[PDB]
C-alpha cells in the first residue's frame, strides 16, 4: 500500500532521512458527514495544490531533491555542513530555522524569476 | 487623493543613524506601478536624488551616498523608510519622498506627486 | 570558503500539532456505519525510533470531535421515529398490588387514560406501567418532560450497542501513537508510533464506573489534568477487569398502542412473575484487590502514609449520582454507594449487590429540552459487563491534614472517551523544508 | 500577506508587466453555506488545475515565462514588437486577440506533440 | 468543443494509437444532487492529482511521452517490438501485464530517486 | 451503419474555385484512425487520387494538383471540403470521397467505403 | 378565534381604534385541557 | 443621483446623501410580554 513505511526517519538524521523523500512524498494526497470526508478531502487537496504550485514558482516542478543557486545567509545559522547533516535531524532543523523561512521563499521567488528573465533574453540573441 | 506623509527626527546629534520614514495615503508600495524616492534639498541648493526603492526591493542609491544611505520599504503596512548613517552637517536639509510612475513603459522618471517636506536640521 | 547554497527537499518528514476532522472507519443501529467508510483488514502500524514527542491528553480536539460526532449521529439516528406529543396527558395511576417487593414498593404504576388512536374523531382508553421517575404529581400524574419539551420515543429497530468505530485521519495528516508503557497522559512520550487508524474505541456512555474499554497494560494508573488541585477530576486505569453483572429480573411484556396514523407507542404491558429490584453484582475481592491497588498507586502521588476514603456520590442529578449505563435498552442507574464506601491508613465466594432504578424518560446529555422513551424489552436483561476505570475527584479543603477523601464524580462524557483517545495525536505534515548544500542550478 | 499587491500592473505596458508575474500567479488557488465554500474552493481547484494541464500539454510545465517554437502569422496581429511591448496593455492585446486563441492553442499542441516526438525518434537511434 | 474524439484510437494500434494521446490527455478533468455533482468533481479532481504525482515522482512531469532508463526485464513480457507495435493494441497489451505493473512502477521510482541523487552527487563538484 | 454523400454545384463556370463537402453518417472525422480521401475518376479515364486530410491537419494532395487544390476538414459538424482552384476543362469528373483504414495500421491504405459519387461538369 | 374588546384604560385620542384586548381558549402542556388566555393585540393583526 | 434611465419614469431613482439626517423614532409605551405555555417545551410570549 502507500502507506508503508510512512515518516519513518523521523528520527534520522538529515541525510539519512533525505533518502527516502519518495515514502512521505507520495502519501500526501490518499449527509452531513459526506460533508466532512468531502470537505477533509478538498482541503487536502488544496494544501498539496497550493505546496505544488509553491514548487513550480521556485523552478523545482517536478522534482524532489532540487538544490537552488541562491546564496545561504550566514545570520540564518552560522552551523557548517558536517555539524547539520550527520548531527541534527530534520525536526530539530525546522524548529531552527523557522523565523527566515518566508525571507528565503521569497529570495527563491525572486531568484528564479531573474534566472527567468535572464535565459529570455539570452534566447532572444 | 494621495499623498504622503514624512515622520521622524526633526533634530538628530550628528553622529549616528538618522531614520525618516515616509508613509503614502492612496496609491500602494506593492503595485509594480511607481518607484518610490527620497529626494533632498538644502538651504540655499538646488534639489540632489538620494535613491529610490521598489516594490520587489530592487532598490538605487545615489552613487555620491551609496555607501552611507539604505532605503527599506515594507509593503504590510504600506511605507518606506530612508537610513542616512554618519550624518554630516551637509545633511541640514528637507527630504522629500516623491513617486515615480516609471512602472511601466508609458513614460520615463517623472516624479509628479511630492510629499509635505520635513526639514531635518543636524 | 564555505560556498554553500540554499536547497529545497520535498516530501520532507517533519510534521506540527494540528486540529482537524476525523472521520469513520467501521467494519441498522445508532451508530451508524452506512454513512461510516470500510476499514482495512491488514492495518498498517509504522513504529518511528529516537522521537519524543509531547502529548497532552487534556488539550485534544479528537476527544471534543467525537463528542460531537456522537451527539450528531444519535440526534440524526432519533430523526426517523414517533413523537410522542398525545402522550402528555393526565394520567390516572396507582399503585401495584400483584407480587409485591418489599424494595419494589412505590414504584411502578399502574396508569391509564385517553389517548387519540387511527380515527381523529375517536379517543381509546389504554393502560400501562409507568415508573416512580417518570411520572410526577401535577390522584393525578403527568410525565415529567412535558413542562421541558415534548420529544420523541426512540424505534424499537435501532440498538444501542457500542460498535468500534475506528478514527482515522485525512490525507496530508497522521495520528501518532504512544506504546510507551507507565505514560501519564501529558508530558514526552519517548515510544511514538504512526498509526493509520485508532483501535476499538467502542462509544459505551457511562458514569462513575467506566464499562468496556482498553485496560492497562503495566498496573493501574492515575492521570489528572493538575492532581494538586481537587477541582480537576481524576481518571483511573485498571490493568485487570472486575467484571460486572447487572440485571432486571422482572419478565415484560410490551403492547403496541396506535396513537396515530401508523405510529406505534410501545408501552409495557404485564409483568408476569414476581416484582423485583433490578441489581448490579459486583464481586467482592476482585473489587478488594482492584482498590487495593488503586490505594497503592493513589499513595504513590499522595505521599507514603496518608488516610485516603472512598465515599459515595456527592450529589446533583440522578446522571451524576449513580451509574448510568444500557444494556439492552434499559438504562440501569446503579447506585454505588457499597462499592465506594471504605478507608485505606498505611500499615470467600460472597459478591456485593448494588441497588438499581429503571428510568425511560432520559436525558443522557447535559442538554435540557431533548428526551428518550426506552421502548420496553421483553424477557430479561444481562449484559455482563467489564469495569476497567473510575472518575474520581478530591474533596478541597482537606489542607495539609493527612485526611484525604476521594469520591466518584463526573457528569461530563469527555472523560470516558478522554479515557480511550489519550495515547494517540492528530499532527500535519511539513513536506517543504530547506537546508544549506553545495550546488549551482546553472 | 499573500494578496500584497494582486494586479496591481494592469495599466502597465506589457513588457513592464510581464515582470510581476509571480504576484498574479500566487493568488490564483487561495448546512448550505458550507457547501457554498466547498463548491466556491473546488471550482477554482478545478480552474486552476484545468490551466495548469493547458500549460503542460504545451511543454511549458513548471515556467511562468516559457516561449516556443512555433511562428507567429502575421494575420493574428500585424502590430510590431515596438508598438506592441511598449506602447499598449495586456487587456488591449488579450482584446484584441481574443478571437485567435483557440488556433493558437491548437498550434502550440500539436507542436509540442511533434517535438517530443521527433525527440523520441532521435533518442531511439 | 474538448471532447472531439475521445477515445478514438481505441482499436488503433500502440504505435498508431501512440499519435493522439493529448485527445485522451486533455479529457481527464472536465440539495443532494449539488453534493453528488460535487463529491463526483472531487473525485475526478483527486484520480487526476494522484496520477499527475505518480506520473512526477518517476520524473515524467510535464512529458506525455516520457521514457526512462530502467531496463526491461524480458520475464514481464516476451514479444518483440514487431509484434506490440504493429501486431497488438492497448487493451491486450494492458491485460497481458496486468500482473506486472506495480513492481514496475516501484522500479521507475527507485531509478528516478537514484538518478536524482546521483545528479546531486556530481553537481555538488 | 456508414456512408458519405457530396454536396456542392454540379455545374460551374470554369476558372475560379470549385467547392464540394463530403459529410460523413458514420465513423467520426475527429477520430484518428481513418484517413478521407478524394478520389476523383473522369469519363473514358480510370480513377486519379487528389489528397486526404487527418483528424489534426497532416493533409497530403496528389503532386499533380499540390497546386490547386486545398483540402480542409472540420469535426464540429463532421464532414470535410475540398477546394479546387482554377479548374479547367479537363476537370470535368466524379468527385468521390473515400474512406481508408490507414491510421491504426493494422493494414496499409485501403479504400474499403465509398461514398455515392457526384458528377461535375464544367 | 378571539372575543375582543377596544380598550378603555388611559387611552388617546390618536391611540383610538387600536390595541384590542382579546380573550381565547388555547391549549396547554396537558393535551386534555383547555385554558382561557388573553392578550393586547394590534388592530392591524386581527381582522373580523 | 442614479437611475438605470433617468428618461424612463418606470425606473426608481436613488439618492445618496452627503451628510446624515438624524432620525429618532420610539414606542412610548412600556409594555409587558408574559410567556403562556401552548404545548410541551413551546411558549407563546403575549402583551399583557
Ligand atoms: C460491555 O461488554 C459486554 C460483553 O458481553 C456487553 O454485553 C453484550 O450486551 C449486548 C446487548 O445487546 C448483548 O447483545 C444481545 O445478546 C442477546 C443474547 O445473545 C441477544 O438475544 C440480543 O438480541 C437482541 O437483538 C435482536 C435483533 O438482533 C432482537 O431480536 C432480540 O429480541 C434482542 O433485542 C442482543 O444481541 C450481547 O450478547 C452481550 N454480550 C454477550 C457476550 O452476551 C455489553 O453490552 C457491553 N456494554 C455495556 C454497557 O455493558
Ligand atoms: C496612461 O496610459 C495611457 C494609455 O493607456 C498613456 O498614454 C500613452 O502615453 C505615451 C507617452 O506619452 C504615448 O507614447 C502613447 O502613445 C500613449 N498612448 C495612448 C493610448 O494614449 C499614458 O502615458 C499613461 N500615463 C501614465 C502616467 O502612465
Ligand atoms: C481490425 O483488427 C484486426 C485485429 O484486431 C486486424 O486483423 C489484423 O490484420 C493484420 C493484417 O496485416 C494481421 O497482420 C494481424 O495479425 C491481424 N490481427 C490479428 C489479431 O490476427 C484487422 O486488420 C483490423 N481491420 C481494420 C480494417 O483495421
Ligand atoms: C564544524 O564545526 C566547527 C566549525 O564550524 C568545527 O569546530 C568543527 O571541526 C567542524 N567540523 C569539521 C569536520 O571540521
Ligand atoms: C403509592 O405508594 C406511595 C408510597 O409512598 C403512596 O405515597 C401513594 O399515595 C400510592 N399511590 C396512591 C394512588 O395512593
Ligand atoms: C392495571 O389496571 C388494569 C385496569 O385498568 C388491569 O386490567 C390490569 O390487570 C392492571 N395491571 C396491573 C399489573 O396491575
Ligand atoms: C377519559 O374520558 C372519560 C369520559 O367520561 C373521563 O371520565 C376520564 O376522566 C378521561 N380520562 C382522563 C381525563 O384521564
Ligand atoms: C417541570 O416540572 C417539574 C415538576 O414539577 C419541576 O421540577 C421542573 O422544575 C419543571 N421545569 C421547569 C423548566 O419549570
Ligand atoms: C472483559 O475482560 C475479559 C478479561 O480477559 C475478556 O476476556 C472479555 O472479552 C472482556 N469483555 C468485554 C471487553 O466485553
Ligand atoms: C506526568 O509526568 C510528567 C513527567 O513524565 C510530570 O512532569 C507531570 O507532573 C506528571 N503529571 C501528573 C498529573 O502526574
Ligand atoms: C496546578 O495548580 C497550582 C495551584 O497552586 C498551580 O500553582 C499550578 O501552576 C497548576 N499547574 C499547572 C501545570 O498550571
Ligand atoms: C417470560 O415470559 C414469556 C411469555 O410466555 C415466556 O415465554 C418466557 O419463558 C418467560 N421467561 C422466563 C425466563 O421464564
Ligand atoms: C446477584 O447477587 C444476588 C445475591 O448474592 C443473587 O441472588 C443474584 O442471583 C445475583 N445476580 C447475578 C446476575 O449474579
Ligand atoms: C457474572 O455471571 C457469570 C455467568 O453467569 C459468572 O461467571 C461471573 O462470575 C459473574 N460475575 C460475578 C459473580 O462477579
Ligand atoms: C450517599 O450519598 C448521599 C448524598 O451525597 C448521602 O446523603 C448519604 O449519607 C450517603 N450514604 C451514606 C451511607 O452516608
Ligand atoms: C445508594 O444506596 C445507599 C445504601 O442504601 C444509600 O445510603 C444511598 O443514599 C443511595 N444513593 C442515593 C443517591 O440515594
Ligand atoms: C514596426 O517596426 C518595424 C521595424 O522595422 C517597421 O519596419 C514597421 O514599419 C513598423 N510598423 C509600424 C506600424 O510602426
Ligand atoms: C476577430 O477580431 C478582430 C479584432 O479587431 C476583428 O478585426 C475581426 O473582424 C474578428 N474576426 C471575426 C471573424 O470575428
Ligand atoms: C372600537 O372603536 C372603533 C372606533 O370607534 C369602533 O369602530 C369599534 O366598533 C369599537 N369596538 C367595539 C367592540 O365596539
Ligand atoms: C372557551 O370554552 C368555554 C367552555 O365551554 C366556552 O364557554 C367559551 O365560549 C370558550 N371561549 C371562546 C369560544 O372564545
Ligand atoms: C430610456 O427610456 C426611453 C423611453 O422613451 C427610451 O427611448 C430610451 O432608449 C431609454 N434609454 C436607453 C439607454 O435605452
Known amino acids: 500500500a502507500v502507506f508503508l513505511g510512512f515518516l519513518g526517519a523521523a528520527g534520522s538524521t538529515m541525510g539519512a532521512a533525505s533518502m527516502t523523500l519518495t515514502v512521505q512524498a507520495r502519501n500526501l494526497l490518499s449527509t452531513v458527514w459526506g460533508i466532512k470526508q468531502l470537505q477533509a478531502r478538498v482541503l487536502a487537496v488544496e494544501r498539496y495544490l497550493r505546496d505544488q504550485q509553491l514548487l513550480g514558482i521556485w523552478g523545482c516542478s517536478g522534482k524532489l531533491i532540487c538544490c537552488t543557486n541562491v546564496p545561504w545567509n550566514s545570520s540564518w545559522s552560522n552551523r557548517n555542513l558536517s555539524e547539520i547533516w550527520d548531527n541534527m535531524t530534520w525536526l530539530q532543523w525546522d524548529k531552527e530555522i523557522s523565523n527566515y523561512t518566508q525571507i528565503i521563499y521569497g529570495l527563491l521567488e525572486e531568484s528564479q524569476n531573474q534566472q527567468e528573465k535572464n535565459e529570455q533574453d539570452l534566447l532572444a540573441l | 487623493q494621495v499623498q504622503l506623509q514624512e515622520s521622524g527626527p526633526g533634530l538628530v546629534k550628528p553622529s549616528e543613524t538618522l531614520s525618516l520614514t515616509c508613509?503614502?495615503?492612496?496609491?500602494?508600495?506593492?503595485?509594480?506601478?511607481?518607484?518610490?524616492?527620497?529626494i533632498r534639498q538644502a538651504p540655499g541648493k538646488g534639489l540632489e536624488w538620494?535613491?529610490?526603492?521598489?516594490?520587489?526591493?530592487?532598490?538605487?542609491?545615489?552613487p555620491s551616498l551609496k555607501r552611507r544611505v539604505r532605503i527599506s520599504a515594507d509593503t504590510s503596512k504600506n511605507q518606506f523608510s530612508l537610513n542616512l548613517r554618519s550624518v554630516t552637517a551637509a545633511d541640514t536639509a528637507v527630504?522629500?519622498?516623491?513617486?515615480?510612475?516609471?512602472?511601466?513603459?508609458?513614460?520615463?522618471?517623472?516624479?509628479?506627486?511630492?510629499?509635505?517636506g520635513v526639514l531635518v536640521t543636524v | 570558503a564555505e560556498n554553500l547554497w540554499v536547497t529545497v527537499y520535498y516530501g520532507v518528514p517533519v510534521w506540527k500539532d494540528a486540529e482537524t476532522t476525523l472521520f469513520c472507519a467501521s467494519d441498522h443501529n445508532v451508530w451508524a456505519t452506512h454513512a461510516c467508510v470500510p476499514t482495512d483488514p491488514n492495518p498498517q502500524e509504522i513504529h518511528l525510533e529516537n522521537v519524543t514527542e509531547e502529548f497532552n491528553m487534556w488539550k485534544n480536539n479528537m476527544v471534543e470531535q467525537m463528542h460531537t460526532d456522537i451527539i450528531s449521529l444519535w440526534d440524526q439516528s432519533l430523526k426517523p421515529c414517533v413523537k410522542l406529543t398525545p402522550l402528555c396527558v393526565t394520567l390516572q395511576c396507582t399503585n401495584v398490588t400483584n407480587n409485591i417487593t418489599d424494595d419494589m414498593r412505590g414504584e411502578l404504576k399502574n396508569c391509564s387514560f385517553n389517548m387519540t388512536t387511527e380515527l381523529r374523531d375517536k379517543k381509546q382508553k389504554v393502560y400501562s406501567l409507568f415508573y416512580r421517575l417518570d411520572v410526577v404529581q401535577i390522584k393525578e400524574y403527568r410525565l415529567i418532560n412535558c413542562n421541558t419539551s415534548a420529544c420523541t420515543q426512540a424505534c424499537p429497530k435501532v440498538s444501542f450497542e457500542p460498535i468500534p468505530i475506528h478514527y482515522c485521519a485525512p490525507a496530508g495528516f497522521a495520528i501518532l501513537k504512544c506504546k510507551d508503557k507507565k505514560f501519564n497522559g501529558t508530558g514526552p512520550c519517548p515510544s511514538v508510533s504512526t498509526v493509520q487508524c485508532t483501535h476499538g474505541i467502542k462509544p459505551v456512555v457511562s458514569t462513575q464506573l467506566l464499562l468496556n474499554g482498553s485496560l492497562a497494560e503495566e498496573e493501574v494508573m492515575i492521570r489528572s489534568e493538575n492532581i494538586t488541585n481537587n477541582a480537576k477530576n481524576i481518571l483511573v486505569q485498571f490493568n485487570t477487569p472486575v467484571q460486572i453483572n447487572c440485571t432486571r429480573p422482572n419478565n415484560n411484556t410490551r403492547k403496541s398502542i396506535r396513537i396515530g396514523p401508523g405510529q406505534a407507542f410501545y408501552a409495557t404491558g404485564d409483568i408476569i412473575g414476581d416484582i423485583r429490584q433490578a441489581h448490579c453484582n459486583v464481586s467482592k475481592a476482585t473489587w478488594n484487590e482492584t482498590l487495593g491497588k488503586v490505594v497503592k498507586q493513589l499513595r504513590k502521588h499522595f505521599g507514603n502514609n496518608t488516610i485516603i476514603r472512598f465515599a459515595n456520590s456527592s450529589g446533583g442529578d440522578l446522571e451524576v449520582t449513580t451509574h448510568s449505563f444500557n444494556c439492552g435498552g434499559e438504562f440501569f442507574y446503579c447506585n454505588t454507594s457499597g462499592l465506594f464506601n471504605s478507608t485505606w491508613i498505611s500499615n470467600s465466594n460472597d459478591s456485593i449487590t448494588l441497588p438499581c432504578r429503571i428510568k425511560q424518560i432520559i436525558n443522557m446529555w447535559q442538554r435540557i429540552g431533548q428526551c428518550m422513551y426506552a421502548p420496553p424489552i421483553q424477557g430479561v436483561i444481562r449484559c455482563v459487563s467489564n469495569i476497567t476505570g473510575l472518575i474520581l475527584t478530591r474533596d478541597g479543603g482537606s489542607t495539609n491534614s493527612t485526611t484525604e477523601t476521594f469520591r466518584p464524580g463526573g457528569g461530563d462524557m469527555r472523560d470516558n472517551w478522554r479515557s480511550e483517545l489519550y495515547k494517540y495525536k492528530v499532527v500535519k505534515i511539513e513536506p517543504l523544508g530547506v537546508a544549506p548544500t553545495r550546488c549551482k542550478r546553472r | 500577506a499573500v494578496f500584497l499587491g494582486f494586479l496591481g500592473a494592469a495599466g502597465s505596458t506589457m513588457g513592464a508587466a510581464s515582470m510581476t508575474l509571480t504576484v498574479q500567479a500566487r493568488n490564483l488557488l487561495s448546512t448550505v453555506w458550507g457547501i457554498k465554500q466547498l463548491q466556491a474552493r473546488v471550482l477554482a481547484v478545478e480552474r486552476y488545475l484545468r490551466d495548469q494541464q493547458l500549460l503542460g500539454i504545451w511543454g511549458c510545465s513548471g515556467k511562468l515565462i516559457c516561449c516556443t517554437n512555433v511562428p507567429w502569422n502575421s494575420s493574428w496581429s500585424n502590430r510590431n514588437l515596438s508598438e506592441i511591448w511598449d506602447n499598449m496593455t495586456w487587456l488591449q492585446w488579450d482584446k484584441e486577440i481574443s478571437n485567435y486563441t483557440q488556433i493558437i492553442y491548437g498550434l502550440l499542441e500539436e507542436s509540442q506533440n511533434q517535438q517530443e516526438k521527433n525527440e523520441q525518434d532521435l533518442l531511439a537511434l | 468543443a474538448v471532447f472531439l474524439g475521445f477515445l478514438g484510437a481505441a482499436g488503433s494500434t500502440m504505435g498508431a494509437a501512440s499519435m493522439t494521446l493529448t485527445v485522451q490527455a486533455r479529457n481527464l478533468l472536465s440539495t443532494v444532487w449539488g453534493i453528488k455533482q460535487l463529491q463526483a468533481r472531487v473525485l475526478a479532481v483527486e484520480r487526476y492529482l494522484r496520477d499527475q504525482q505518480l506520473l512526477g515522482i518517476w520524473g515524467c512531469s510535464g512529458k506525455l511521452i516520457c521514457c526512462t532508463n530502467v531496463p526491461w526485464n524480458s520475464s514481464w513480457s516476451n514479444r518483440n517490438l514487431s509484434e506490440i507495435w504493429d501486431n497488438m493494441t492497448w487493451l491486450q497489451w494492458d491485460k497481458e501485464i496486468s500482473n506486472y505493473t506495480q513492481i514496475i512502477y516501484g522500479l521507475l521510482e527507485e531509478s528516478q530517486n537514484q538518478q536524482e541523487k546521483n545528479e546531486q552527487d556530481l553537481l555538488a563538484l | 451503419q456508414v456512408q458519405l454523400q457530396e454536396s456542392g454545384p454540379g455545374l460551374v463556370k470554369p476558372s475560379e474555385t470549385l467547392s464540394l463537402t463530403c459529410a460523413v453518417y458514420?465513423?467520426?472525422?475527429?477520430?484518428?484512425?481513418?484517413?478521407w480521401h478524394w478520389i476523383r475518376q473522369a469519363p473514358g479515364k480510370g480513377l486519379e487520387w487528389i489528397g486526404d486530410?487527418?483528424?489534426?491537419?497532416?493533409?497530403g494532395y496528389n503532386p499533380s494538383l499540390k497546386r490547386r487544390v486545398r483540402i480542409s476538414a472540420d469535426t464540429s459538424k463532421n464532414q470535410f471540403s475540398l477546394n479546387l482552384r482554377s479548374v479547367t476543362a479537363a476537370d470535368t469528373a466524379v468527385y468521390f470521397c473515400?474512406?481508408?483504414?490507414?491510421?491504426?495500421?493494422?493494414?496499409?491504405?485501403?479504400?474499403?467505403?465509398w461514398g455515392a459519387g457526384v458528377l461535375v461538369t464544367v | 378565534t378571539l372575543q375582543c374588546t377596544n380598550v378603555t384604560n388611559n387611552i388617546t385620542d390618536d391611540m383610538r381604534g387600536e390595541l384590542k384586548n382579546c380573550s381565547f381558549n388555547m391549549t396547554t402542556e396537558l393535551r386534555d385541557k383547555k385554558q382561557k388566555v388573553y392578550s393586547l393585540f394590534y388592530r392591524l393583526d386581527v381582522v373580523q | 443621483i442614479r437611475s438605470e434611465n433617468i428618461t424612463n419614469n418606470a425606473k426608481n431613482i436613488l439618492v445618496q446623501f452627503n451628510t446624515p439626517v438624524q432620525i429618532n423614532c420610539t414606542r412610548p409605551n412600556n409594555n409587558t410580554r408574559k410567556s403562556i405555555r401552548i404545548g410541551p417545551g413551546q411558549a407563546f410570549y403575549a402583551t399583557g
Open positions: 473515400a474512406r481508408d483504414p490507414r491510421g491504426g495500421g493494422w493494414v496499409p491504405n485501403r479504400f474499403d467505403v
Open positions: 458514420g465513423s467520426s472525422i475527429s477520430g484518428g484512425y481513418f484517413y
Open positions: 486530410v487527418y483528424f489534426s491537419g497532416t493533409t
